Design a protein around this ligand. Structure first.
Ligand SMILES: Nc1ncnc2c1ncn2[C@@H]1O[C@H](COP(=O)(O)OP(=O)(O)NP(=O)(O)O)[C@@H](O)[C@H]1O
Ligand SMILES: [Mg+2]
Ligand SMILES: [Mg+2]
Lengths: 339, 1134, 331
C-alpha cells in the first residue's frame, strides 16, 4: 500500500476532472498522409499516416456515419471518445486529436508498428513459461488501474492488444467498455471471451474482467482456447458447461490460478471477494513479478520487435488501400454533438 | 443411461437394483457385455478432476504436502454422514439387551416384544446402507488414487526412471488393489467403540455399581496376550518364508529342466529332495498353525470367564436376581465382542491407511521431467559445447552440430556409446550440463528398441491420426511394408495382440520406420532403423523414402553404414564418447584417407478332499461325538435343574453359547494336524504324478502354469484352508447346538426354524452363482490395466516423443471404468445378499420371540439370551460359507491336475518310424529306417538346420512317437521306458545342473564310491576343473552352477554320462556351444575315452561333422543313408 | 594378556632398534634369474627369480625411479622400504635384500607359491563362512600387531593378500604403509577401500583400517563390494552415505558386528572406542577364533593351494643416470 493507494487516489483525483471537460473538433483531415492501412477494424477503415506538420507517424481511424446509427452502436463510440481522452497509464498509447467531418470521424492515435501478438503467436504457437507472465503482469496492472476508474473493460482479446518498439504490449479500441457503477444488461463482442453470467443475461458486474484475462492467459499458453466450437451456440454450451482440461505441459502451480480464474462461481471469483488485486498480487505463478519495477519498465522484454524504421510496417501484413472524397450530409448529425 | 440412476428411495434402500441382474444370472451364464452402465458420478474423468484440483490447491497452499489434509476436504462430509448413522446403529444394538431387562419380571411385555422386534428392523436399516455408502466412498477414492499416479507417470524424470524400481510401483499398485477399498468398514469404529465402552460401563455400573472394572481387566489382559501371540506368529511366518522360497527355486529349476530330468531318470531323487526340504517347513507351519489356533480359540473361550469373574465378586458380596445375570451376560457379550475384535482391527486399518498415505505422498513428489520450450520459430538448428554425464563421465566432448534446415545429418561410432544419449539430449530426454542446444522441437525419434502396442495396422500407423490414403500408401510401399501388409491375413486390419510375436524383428523395425515417417516434423531422429533388415532392403528403403522423401526436410539418422555415410550431408564419428573427426562429407573424407579406409466346487471334489487321509474321518467322528455328548449333557442338566446358589451360578454355564459349545482344546489340535498332514500327502501325490505325466500333455500347458500349480496353491492349502475350515466348522457346531437348546425349551421351535433354514439355503445357493460369476469376471478383467501399465512402461520414451498422451489417458480411464463396473456390481450383489440374510434372521427371531411370549422364568431368559447372541454367529457363519466356497477352487484345481495319465551289444535297427510333438501332429518321420554300426559314429548330416532335435528326442522316445527300435535284439516294448532309455547318452545343447554340491549334483542316485568318482573325474578332466572350486567337492552350485562355463558344463555332462556307462551317446552342437580351447579339449577327451561308443554328433555345418565315419543324411520327410562321402558329398550335399 | 602382552612389548622394543639401523644396497642384480614376470603391480614390474648362489626362489619388485619421481611417490617408497626391512611378524612374508641400480631398484621377497586370494575368490565366487573367519582371524591379528607399533597401512585391496604353503595368508604391498602417530591429511588409494574420513579430505588416523577390514570380510563373503557405482564420484557419494544392504545369506551375528564395523561414526567405529581389539576379540563372529593358538598357525586351513614346486607358476598368471639419485640416498 502506502505509495500504491496514494497513487490510485492521485489518478482518481484527476480522472473525473478531465471526464468533466470533454473536447471537440481538435483537428481536420488536412494534415495527414496515406502511406498504408494497418487493418480494417470491425465496421470501419483505418490508415497508417504521417503528420504533415510534424512528421510523427500516427494512425487515422474511420467509420461510416450510418454504421453508428444502423447497428445501434452510435453513443457506444460517444462514451469511448471521452474515455480515451483522459487516460494516463504507461501500458497504453495516448492520442493527440480527432477529426469532425460530415461523413465520418477520425481518431489520431499512436502508430506502434509492433503489431498484434496474435500473429506472432500464430507464427509461434505457444508462449514460454515466463514469456506469458511478462505480459500477464502488465495485464494485471492494467486491470487494477482501469477497475479503479469505475469502468467495465469488456474488452480483452488478442486482437485488442498490440506491441511497442521497446517490447511493451498496449491495448486499444475502447468501444466495448462502459464506465458503469451498478447492474446492467448490456452485452456485446465476441463469445470467445464470454462469461457464464454474460450468456446468462443478468445484471453484470466487474467480475467478468478477471475471467476474460484468465481466458486470454490460458489461450496464450497453448494457442487453443479451452473453449472451441463450430458455432457460438455450441461454444456458449461449452461455456455453460464449465468443464475444461488444462494443457499437459502447463505448470500445476499455474494450473491453480487457472482454476481460480475461470471459477464459475461469480461470488467466489479470484480477486473479487475482499482482497481485490492482492490475491493476484500474491499468486505463486507470479513469484517473479516486480510490480513497481515493471512499472518503471526496466525489465528486459522476453521478445522484442525487430523494428526497421518508423515507416516500416514489416510486422504488419497489410499493403492495401481505401479512398473517399466528400459528402454533404451526416447520418444523424444531431447525434454527433460530442464527437 | 444407468439403471441405478432410475431408482426410487425405497428401491435404493432395498438395493433391488440387481434384481433383474440376479434374474438373468441365476437363469443363464454370465455375459460380460450385459453389465449395467457405470454410474455418472463414478466417472474416472469426473472424480480425478476434483481430486487433482484439490491436490494442486494444497500443493500450492503450504510447505507440507499433507495429501490427507487435502482428501479430507474431498470426503470428510460424507464420511461423517455415514458415520453418524453407523454410530447410532451401534448404540442401538448395544442398548437393545437392556430392553430385555424388563421382560424377565414375568401382559405389558407384548408391547415390549413388538418393540424389540422393531428394533431389529431399525438396526438393520441403520447398518445395511452404511456399508455400501462407505465402500462406494472407498472405491471412488481408490479410482483417483490410481489416476493421480497414472498422470504422474508421464511426468517423472527419466534420470530417476532408470533408478526407480520397476517392481516397486507395481507392488504399490497391487498392494491397495483390494485392501484399501475394503479397509473403510472399520473407519468410524474408532469414533464408536470408545463410545460403546462408555455406554456399556454405565450399563454395568447401573446393574452393579460395585463390580465394573473386574472383567474389564481380564478383557484387557486377553487382548494383551492375543496381541503378543501375533509377534511370535509373524516370526514363525518369516522363518518359514525363506525355506519356502528355496524350495520354490528348486522346484522352478526342476520345471525348467523337466525334459532333461525325464531323460536322466532322476524323478525319485528330485521327489526325495523336495520332500526332505519340505519337512522342516512343515514343522514350522505346524508350529505356526498351533499358535494361530490357540489365538483363535482364546476369543471363543474367553466368554465363560468374562461373565464368571464379573459376577463372582457381586454374587459373593450379596444376592442378585437372575434377571440382572442374564442382562449382564448379554452386556458382557457385546463388550467383549467389541473390545477383542473392533478395536485392534480399526487400529490396524488406520495405521495401514496412514502408512499408505505417507508412501503415496512421497511418491508423487519426485522431481519431474522439464519439457523444452520450443516450437516457436527457428531456422536451421545448431548445437554448441555439448558436454554432460549420462547419470563425471562426459557423454559429449564439447560437441557442436549445426544442422541445416533441410539437411541429412548422420553420425557413426560405437553402438549406444553416447551417440544415442546425444540424440536423446537433443530430443530433450537428457538435460545438457554444458553449452546450449537450440532446436525447433517438433521432431520424431526412432529408438533402436521397438515399442509396439497392441492394435491393428491403422492403429499402429496413426497413434492419434486420421486415415491418409496417399501417406499410408507411400509409407507401405517405401518401407518394404506393403508386401508385409499383404502378408497379413486381413492385410489391412489385423488387430495385433500382446507380445508382438505376430511379426518379425525386421518387421518391427519397418513398423518403427513407418511410424516415424507417419508425422511430418522438423527432424527425424533415426537410430539405426535398418538395424534388423538385409542390406538390399536397407538400401531400397533409403532410396525410396529415407533418402528421397524426408531427406528434403531436415533429418538426423544414426547410421554407421559406410555407403550411406559417403552420401551424408555431414558426418560425426565419435570414439570413447569423443568426436575424433566430423564435418563435411568430402572434407572429412579427404582430411584423413587412412582413417576413412580403416573405419570403412463339486460335491465329488469335497468327498475326494475328505477321502485323502483316513485320520481325518476319525478326528471328525471324535469331535462330532464330543459335541453331541456335550449337548446331551447340557440338555440333561437344564431339564433336571428346571424340573445352593452354586446351582443358580451354573446357569451361567448355559448362558454363553460360545463357551458351552466351544471346541475343546483336547479336540481342535488334531483337526489342524490332520489338515496339515493331508496337505503334505497331497503335495507328495502331486509331485509323484507330475513326474510321470506324458510330455505330449505337458507341452500343451504353458510352463508357467506348472509354476503356478504350486507357487500359491499349495500355500493357500497349507495356510488359508485349514483355519477357515476349522472356524466354519466350530461356528456351525455352536449354532446348531444353540438351535437344539432352543428346541429343547418348547415343542414349537423346530416347526418354524426348519423353513427358515431351508429358505436360507435356497437363498445362499441362488446368490452363489452370481457371486462366483462376478468374482471371476472381475478377476479376469483386472489384468488389462496392468497390461496397459506395462505397455506404457515399455514405451515411455517413444510416448514422450509422440506427445499424444491424451489417448493413453483415455485408454487407461476406459479400462479402469470397465473394471470398476464389475467391482461395483459384485459389491452391490454382496450387499443385497447381506441385507436379505439379515432380514431372514430378523424374521426368524421375531417369530420365535412371539412364540415364546405366547408361552417358567429361566427357560424364557435362556431362550431370549440365546436369541440375543445368535446373530453375530450367523453372520460369521455366512461369511465362512462364502470363504469356503472361494477356497474350494484351489482344491478343485489341484484335483484336476493330479487327475492325469502317466506316460505309460551296440547294434540296432530302426524301421516304421512315426513321430510327432502331439498325437497325430507333424510327422517327424515317414516310416524312417536306420542301422547302427558297431562302435562307429554316424554323422547326422543332410538337411541340417531343418531341425534335428526332434530326431534326437525320438532316439529316447521323448515325443509322441511310435514305430520299431530293435537295439541288440531288444525291442522298444518289452523293456520299461525307465530301463530302455538308459542306454542312450544325452548331450543337450543346454546343460541341466542341479543346484547343489558337486557330490550330489553329479551323483543324484548316490550309488558309487567317492574314490571312483575322483578317479573318473581325473579321467574326465574335472579334477583341475574342480580344484578352483570352494573346498574340494562340496561347492554348492549356486545360481544353477553359475561358476561353470558352457564348455566346463559340457565336460561335466560328458563325465556324468561316462559315469552312467551308457551304450550310446548322441552329440549335438559341439562347436556351436564350445569356445576354441574348450572345443579342442572336448574333442581330445571324446576321441580318447569315448572312442568305444556308437556316437551321433549332430552338426549344422557339414565340415564339423566331416570327421565322422558313417553318415546319415537328413531330408524333408525322408532321412536317407549315405555310407560314404564318395556319394554323400556328391548327392546329399550336391 | 600376560604372555601376549609380554611378547607385544618385546616386539615394540625391538622395532625401534631395527628402525634406527636400516640397511642399504644389500645386493646387486647379478645373482638372480629372469624366468618369468610374476606381474606388474601398481606402477612397477614383478618377476620370479632364483638365487644363483643358494637356489631359493625369490621375487624381485622392480620399479622405475623416474616413475617414483613423476608419480610424486618417493617418500612413500622410502618409508615402505624401511618398514619392510624392519618388520617382524609371522603373518607376512619378510623382505630379504635390496637392490639399487642406476636404472631401477629391486626388492628381494620370498617365493609365494599360493598366489593372490582374489583370483581364487573369483574362481570360487563365495567362500564358506568358517573359511572367511579363518582368514579374518589372522587379518585381525596382523592389524592389531600393526597397532602395537602405531603405523597406518593406507592400503587394502583383495589382490594384496597371498596364501602360504601352510595355507596362511601372506601380506605384501607395504607401499602406502607409514609409521605416523596421530592424524594425517594425505589421501589416495582404492575408492572401494576409501573411508568417508579420507573421502572428506580431513586428517586420517588408524581408525579407517577397521572399516577396510570390515569391507574385506563383507566382500569376501558376498563376492560383490558393499559400495559399488559406475563412476567414482557416485561411488564416493555412496560411500559418504554409508548405507548398504546385507546379503540374504548373511548371518545375524556377523552382520550385526559388520554394522558396528561399517558405522559411519568414526568415533563409534568398532576397534577404536576404548579397548583397542578386545571388543572385537570377544565378538561372537570370533567365538571360535583362537588368537593365541593362531600364533603357531596350527589350525586346519579352509583350503590349501595346489603347490607343485616353487618354479611352477600355475597359481600365478601367465603374462608378459638415475632419476633424482639424491632423493634415493638410503636404498
Ligand atoms: N495504436 C495503433 N497503431 C497502429 N495500428 C493500430 C493501432 N490500433 C490498431 N491498430 C491497427 O488497426 C487495425 C484494425 O483497426 P482496429 O482498431 O482494431 O478497429 P476495431 O474495430 O476496433 N478492431 P476489433 O474491435 O477488435 O474488431 C488493427 O489490426 C491494428 O493493427
Ligand atoms: Mg475491428
Ligand atoms: Mg480491435
Amino acid at each position: 500500500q502506502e505509495s500504491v493507494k496514494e497513487f490510485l487516489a492521485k489518478a482518481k483525483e484527476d480522472f473525473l476532472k478531465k471526464w468533466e471537460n470533454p473536447a471537440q473538433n481538435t483537428a481536420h483531415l488536412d494534415q495527414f498522409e496515406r502511406i498504408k492501412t494497418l487493418g480494417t477494424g470491425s465496421f470501419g477503415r483505418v490508415m497508417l499516416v504521417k503528420h504533415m506538420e510534424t512528421g510523427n507517424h500516427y494512425a487515422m481511424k474511420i467509420l461510416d456515419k450510418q454504421k453508428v446509427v444502423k447497428l445501434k452502436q452510435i453513443e457506444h463510440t460517444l462514451n469511448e471518445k471521452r474515455i480515451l481522452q483522459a487516460v494516463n497509464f504507461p501500458f497504453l498509447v495516448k492520442l493527440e486529436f480527432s477529426f469532425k467531418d460530415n461523413s465520418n470521424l477520425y481518431m489520431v492515435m499512436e502508430y506502434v508498428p509492433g503489431g498484434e501478438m496474435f500473429s506472432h503467436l500464430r507464427r509461434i504457437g505457444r508462449f514460454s513459461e515466463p514469456h506469458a507472465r511478462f505480459y500477464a503482469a502488465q495485464i494485471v496492472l492494467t486491470f487494477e488501474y482501469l477497475h479503479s476508474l469505475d469502468l467495465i473493460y469488456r474488452d480483452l482479446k488478442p486482437e485488442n492488444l498490440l506491441i511497442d518498439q521497446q517490447g511493451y504490449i498496449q491495448v486499444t479500441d475502447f468501444g466495448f467498455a462502459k464506465r458503469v457503477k451498478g447492474r446492467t444488461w448490456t452485452l456485446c463482442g465476441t463469445p470467445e471471451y464470454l462469461a457464464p453470467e454474460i450468456i446468462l443475461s443478468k445484471g453484470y458486474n466487474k467480475a467478468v474482467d478477471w475471467w476474460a484475462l484468465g481466458v486470454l492467459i490460458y489461450e496464450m499458453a497453448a494457442g487453443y482456447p479451452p473453449f472451441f466450437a463450430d458455432q457460438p451456440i455450441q461454444i456458449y454450451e461449452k461455456i455453460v458447461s464449465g468443464k475444461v482440461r488444462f494443457p499437459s505441459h502447463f505448470s500445476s502451480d499455474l494450473k491453480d490460478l487457472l482454476r481460480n480464474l475461470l471459477q464459475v462461481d461469480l461470488t467466489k471469483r479470484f480477486g473479487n471477494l475482499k482482497n481485490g488485486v492482492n490475491d493476484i498480487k500474491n499468486h505463486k505463478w507470479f513469484a517473479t513479478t516486480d510490480w513497481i519495477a515493471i512499472y518503471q519498465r526496466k525489465v528486459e522484454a522476453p521478445f522484442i520487435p525487430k523494428f526497421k524504421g518508423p515507416g516500416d510496417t514489416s510486422n504488419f501484413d497489410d499493403y492495401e488501400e481505401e479512398e473517399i472524397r466528400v459528402s454533404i450530409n451526416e447520418k444523424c448529425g444531431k447525434e454527433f454533438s460530442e464527437f | 443411461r444407468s439403471p441405478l440412476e432410475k431408482a426410487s428411495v425405497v428401491s435404493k434402500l432395498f438395493f433391488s437394483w440387481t434384481r433383474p441382474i440376479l434374474r438373468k444370472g441365476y437363469r443363464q451364464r454370465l455375459e460380460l457385455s450385459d453389465i449395467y452402465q457405470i454410474p455418472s458420478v463414478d466417472s474416472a474423468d469426473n472424480l480425478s478432476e476434483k481430486l487433482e484440483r484439490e491436490w494442486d490447491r494444497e500443493l500450492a497452499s503450504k510447505k507440507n504436502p499433507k495429501l490427507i489434509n487435502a482428501l479430507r476436504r474431498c470426503f470428510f462430509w460424507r464420511f461423517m454422514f455415514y458415520g453418524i448413522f453407523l454410530y447410532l446403529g451401534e448404540v442401538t444394538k448395544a442398548v437393545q439387551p437392556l430392553l430385555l431387562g424388563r421382560i424377565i419380571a414375568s401382559s405389558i411385555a407384548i408391547y415390549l416384544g413388538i418393540g424389540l422386534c422393531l428394533l431389529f428392523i431399525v438396526r438393520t436399516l441403520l447398518l445395511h446402507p452404511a456399508i455400501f455408502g462407505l465402500h462406494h466412498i472407498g472405491m471412488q477414492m481408490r479410482i483417483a488414487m490410481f489416476s493421480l499416479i497414472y498422470k504422474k507417470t508421464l511426468k517423472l524424470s527419466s534420470r530417476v526412471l532408470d533408478k526407480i524400481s520397476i517392481g516397486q510401483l507395481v507392488s504399490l499398485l497391487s498392494n491397495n488393489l483390494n485392501k484399501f477399498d475394503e479397509g473403510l468398514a472399520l473407519a468410524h469404529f474408532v469414533w464408536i467403540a470408545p463410545l460403546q465402552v462408555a455406554l456399556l460401563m454405565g450399563l454395568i455400573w447401573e446393574l452393579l455399581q460395585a463390580s465394573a472394572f473386574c472383567g474389564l481387566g481380564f478383557l484387557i489382559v486377553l487382548a494383551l496376550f492375543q496381541a503378543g501371540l501375533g509377534r511370535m506368529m509373524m516370526k514363525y511366518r518369516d522363518q518359514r518364508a525363506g525355506k519356502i522360497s528355496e524350495r520354490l527355486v528348486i522346484t522352478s529349476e526342476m520345471i525348467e529342466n523337466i525334459q532333461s530330468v525325464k531323460a536322466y531318470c532322476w524323478e525319485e531323487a528330485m521327489e526325495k529332495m523336495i520332500e526332505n526340504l519340505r519337512q522342516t517347513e512343515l514343522k514350522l507351519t505346524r508350529k505356526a498353525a498351533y499358535v494361530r489356533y490357540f489365538n483363535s480359540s482364546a476369543f471363543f473361550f474367553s466368554g465363560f470367564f468374562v461373565v464368571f469373574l464379573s459376577v463372582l465378586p457381586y454374587a459373593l458380596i450379596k444376592g442378585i436376581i437372575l434377571r440382572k445375570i442374564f442382562t449382564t451376560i448379554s452386556f458382557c457379550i457385546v463388550l467383549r465382542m467389541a473390545v477383542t475384535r473392533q478395536f485392534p482391527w480399526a487400529v490396524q486399518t488406520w495405521y495401514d491407511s496412514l502408512g499408505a498415505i505417507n508412501k503415496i505422498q512421497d511418491f508423487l513428489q519426485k522431481q519431474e521431467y522439464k519439457t523444452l520450450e520450443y516450437n516457436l520459430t527457428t531456422t536451421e538448428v545448431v548445437m554448441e559445447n555439448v558436454t554432460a554425464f549420462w547419470e563425471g563421465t562426459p557423454v559429449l566432448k564439447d560437441i557442436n552440430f549445426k544442422i541445416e534446415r533441410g539437411q541429412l545429418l548422420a553420425v557413426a561410432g560405437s553402438t549406444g556409446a553416447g551417440k544415442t544419449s546425444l540424440l536423446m539430449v537433443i530430443m530433450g530426454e537428457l538435460e545438457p550440463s554444458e553449452g546450449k542446444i537450440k532446436h525447433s522441437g517438433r521432431i520424431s525419434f526412432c529408438s533402436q528398441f521397438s515399442w509396439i502396442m497392441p492394435g491393428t495396422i491403422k492403429e499402429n500407423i496413426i497413434f492419434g491420426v486420421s486415415y491418409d490414403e496417399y501417406r499410408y500408401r507411400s509409407v507401405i510401399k517405401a518401407c518394404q511394408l506393403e508386401e508385409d501388409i499383404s502378408k497379413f491375413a486381413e492385410k489391412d486390419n489385423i488387430v495385433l495382440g500382446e507380445g508382438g510375436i505376430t511379426l518379425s524383428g525386421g518387421q518391427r523395425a519397418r513398423i518403427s520406420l513407418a511410424r516415424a515417417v507417419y508425422k511430418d516434423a522438423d527432424l527425424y531422429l533415426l537410430d539405426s532403423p535398418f538395424g534388423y533388415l538385409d542390406v538390399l532392403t536397407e538400401k531400397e528403403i533409403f532410396e525410396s523414402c529415407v533418402c528421397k522423401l524426408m531427406a528434403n526436410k531436415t533429418r538426423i539418422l544414426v547410421t554407421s553404414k559406410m555407403e550411406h555415410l559417403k552420401k551424408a550431408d555431414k558426418i560425426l564419428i565419435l570414439h570413447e564418447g569423443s568426436s575424433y573427426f566430423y564435418g563435411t562429407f568430402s572434407e572429412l573424407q579427404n582430411l584423413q584417407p587412412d582413417f576413412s579406409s580403416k573405419l570403412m466346487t463339486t460335491w465329488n471334489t469335497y468327498l475326494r478332499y475328505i477321502t485323502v487321509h483316513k485320520s481325518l474321518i476319525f478326528v471328525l467322528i471324535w469331535c462330532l461325538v464330543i459335541f453331541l455328548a456335550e449337548v446331551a449333557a447340557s440338555l440333561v442338566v437344564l431339564w433336571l435343574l428346571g424340573n445352593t446358589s452354586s446351582y443358580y451360578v451354573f446357569y451361567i454355564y448355559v448362558g454363553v453359547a460360545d463357551t458351552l459349545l466351544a471346541m475343546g482344546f483336547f479336540r481342535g489340535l488334531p483337526l489342524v494336524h490332520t489338515l496339515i498332514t493331508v496337505s503334505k500327502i497331497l503335495h507328495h501325490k502331486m509331485l509323484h504324478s507330475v513326474l510321470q505325466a506324458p510330455m505330449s500333455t505337458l507341452n500343451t500347458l504353458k510352463a508357467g502354469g506348472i509354476l503356478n500349480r504350486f507357487s500359491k496353491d499349495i500355500a493357500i492349502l497349507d495356510d488359508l484352508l485349514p483355519l477357515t475350515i476349522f472356524d466354519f466348522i466350530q461356528l456351525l457346531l455352536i449354532v446348531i447346538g444353540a438351535i437344539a437348546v432352543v428346541a429343547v425349551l418348547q415343542p414349537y421351535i423346530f416347526v418354524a426354524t426348519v423353513p427358515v433354514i431351508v429358505a436360507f439355503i435356497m437363498l445362499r445357493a441362488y446368490f452363489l452363482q452370481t457371486s462366483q460369476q462376478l468374482k471371476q469376471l472381475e478377476s479376469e478383467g483386472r489384468s488389462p490395466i496392468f497390461t496397459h501399465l506395462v505397455t506404457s512402461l515399455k514405451g515411455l520414451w517413444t510416448l514422450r516423443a509422440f506427445g499424444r498422451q491424451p489417448y493413453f489417458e483415455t485408454l487407461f480411464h476406459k479400462a479402469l471404468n470397465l473394471h470398476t463396473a464389475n467391482w461395483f456390481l459384485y459389491l452391490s450383489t454382496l450387499r443385497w445378499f447381506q441385507m436379505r440374510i439379515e432380514m431372514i434372521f430378523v424374521i426368524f427371531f421375531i417369530a420365535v420371540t412371539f412364540i415364546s411370549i405366547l408361552t417358567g422364568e429361566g427357560r424364557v431368559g435362556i431362550i431370549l439370551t440365546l436369541a440375543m447372541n445368535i446373530m453375530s454367529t450367523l453372520q460369521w457363519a455366512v461369511n465362512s460359507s462364502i470363504d469356503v466356497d472361494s477356497l474350494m477352487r484351489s482344491v478343485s484345481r489341484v484335483f484336476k491336475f493330479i487327475d492325469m495319465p502317466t506316460e505309460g551289444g551296440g547294434q540296432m535297427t530302426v524301421k516304421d518310424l512315426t513321430a510327432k510333438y502331439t498325437e497325430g501332429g507333424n510327422a517327424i518321420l515317414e516310416n524312417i529306417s536306420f542301422s547302427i554300426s558297431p562302435g562307429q559314429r554316424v554323422g547326422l548330416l543332410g538337411r541340417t538346420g531343418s531341425g534335428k532335435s526332434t530326431l534326437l528326442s525320438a532316439f529316447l522316445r521323448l515325443l509322441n512317437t511310435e514305430g520299431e527300435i530293435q537295439i541288440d535284439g531288444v525291442s522298444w516294448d518289452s523293456i520299461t521306458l525307465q530301463q530302455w532309455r538308459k542306454a542312450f547318452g544325452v548331450i543337450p545343447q543346454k546343460v541341466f545342473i542341479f543346484s547343489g554340491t558337486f557330490r550330489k549334483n553329479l551323483d543324484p542316485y548316490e550309488q558309487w564310491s567317492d574314490q571312483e568318482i575322483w578317479k573318473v573325474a581325473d579321467e574326465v578332466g574335472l579334477r583341475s576343473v574342480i580344484e578352483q572350486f570352494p573346498g574340494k567337492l562340496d561347492f554348492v552350485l549356486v545360481d544353477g552352477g553359475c561358476v561353470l562355463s558352457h564348455g566346463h558344463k559340457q565336460l561335466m555332462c560328458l563325465a556324468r554320462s561316462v559315469l552312467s556307462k551308457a551304450k550310446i551317446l548322441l552329440l549335438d552342437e559341439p562347436s556351436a556351444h564350445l569356445d576354441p580351447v574348450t572345443y579342442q579339449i572336448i574333442r581330445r577327451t571324446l576321441k580318447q575315452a569315448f572312442a568305444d561308443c556308437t556316437v551321433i554328433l549332430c552338426e549344422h555345418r557339414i565340415e564339423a561333422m566331416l570327421e565322422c565315419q558313417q553318415f546319415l543324411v537328413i531330408e524333408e520327410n525322408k532321412v536317407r543313408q549315405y555310407d560314404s562321402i564318395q556319394k554323400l558329398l556328391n548327392e546329399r550335399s550336391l
